[PDB]
Amino acid sequence: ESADLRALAKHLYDSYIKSFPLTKAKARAILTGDKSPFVIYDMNSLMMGEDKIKEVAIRIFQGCQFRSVEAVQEITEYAKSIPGFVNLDLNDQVTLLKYGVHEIIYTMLASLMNKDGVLISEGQGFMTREFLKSLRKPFGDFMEPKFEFAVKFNALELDDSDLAIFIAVIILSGDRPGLLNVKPIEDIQDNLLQALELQLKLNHPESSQLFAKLLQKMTDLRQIVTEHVQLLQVIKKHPLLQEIY
Amino acid sequence: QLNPESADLRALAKHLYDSYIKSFPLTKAKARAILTGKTTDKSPFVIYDMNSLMMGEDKSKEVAIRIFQGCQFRSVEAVQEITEYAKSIPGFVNLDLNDQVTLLKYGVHEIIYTMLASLMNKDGVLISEGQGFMTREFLKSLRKPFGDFMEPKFEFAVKFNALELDDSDLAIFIAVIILSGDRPGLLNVKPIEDIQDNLLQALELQLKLNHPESSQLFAKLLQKMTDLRQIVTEHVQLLQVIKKTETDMSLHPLLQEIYKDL
Ligand SMILES: *c1ccc([N+](=O)[O-])cc1C(=O)Nc1ccccc1
């Protein structure tokens, strides 16, 4: 039992490092304390930030779309490193990714957030929570719930080795709509759940019931995703450019 | 064997189970006995259509609205039972009163649908303390938007029931649900987290002892909390539609208060 589980944890960690350029460890060192990020706290600061790194709200949402598309490819590469994933039915792999990416994106974005803002462009920039909140509707309320979630998620003080297994657990969710063969997805998630539990007990022996607390955060996470999707529909309100997004 | 710290967790499990039985008059054990025909004395009358619905009241609105009103007022009575159970959870009544109200406000419906699953199979749901059984098909046939009210609960129930939890398991699970430190507007999160920590420990051990062959049942149970939240979020929205389309339909103030700015 045990050998399999520590091999799985190390493997996922190594893959996670390969696939995700800006890890939580690198990000936390930026948000605490040789180069600080360029801080975007203003309309004017945003203007200069573009010179360094139609209107303001729309241009930021577009940058945000670009970043999303990058992140989905990172996540897809990672998913394919999870033992068993590529041997699943192809439709099912596509379904797991389709419904998993948003959960994964905002989980991992918490690594780049504190209560005051979020790192951008590989940690070269920092956009303040208040600046994003000041954007005119409906853009002003776009990131706020992700910040609220992140504050609660970051209080678990998970590190990259923990998160690598948790993200894999998220990917292997057997309740996604339209799955054809749920059994092996649950079988793999069971194994990943065992590996996460062990990892959190070995890595954080003093955090009582960290495993249970982490799993419970999915409830808030799925809430934020459903709100996000609804807002995206509301926002839908160069052809080749429209196609990519 | 058991050590002193795990012994205390067993005592807590037993206390919660005991309070659960005293608080909730129709248990999963009784519901399953009714449903699976351990019965000559316990057989329900089955409501599957208009004429059988009529006959059921022997043992004035329209059909869809009358059922919904009955469903409403049973909800209220269930909130009462959950509130009396909550008081039994050690530490709960010692919390800030405002936090007691917040925890109930956000937790009571997640508990309602957890326990409703006990009274459901794929074909319908037990009603009136298990004396009746209303079919899923009949409910789904009610006019819009009432016909889609209960379907999400059935879909959740069938998956939840595959975990094969018993009342002793459920008693600790519903306590964990109530003592969530991540509910919005809580004043003092720490004391709540400390209670849940202990409850989570007691649930883990309970599932290990009661279901030793069921791998990661604890994790799989905790994952179902997300389904519950999604039910409650959706259910609320459907209520707002119903209110607006039926200006003559009354919502009980307890329920209206619970959903207010949720
Ligand atoms: C920004 C705008 C729109 C979407 N969307 O269409 O879903 C997503 C985002 C977003 O959050 N992208 C992102 C991903 C990862 C890190 C930062 C930003």
Ligand SMILES: *c1ccc([N+](=O)[O-])cc1C(=O)Nc1ccccc1
């Ligand atoms: C039925 C109709 C309306 C509401 N509501 O307004 O919230 C709720 C319900 C309902 O779920 N009733 C119920 C819950 C649990 C067990 C039996 C009946």
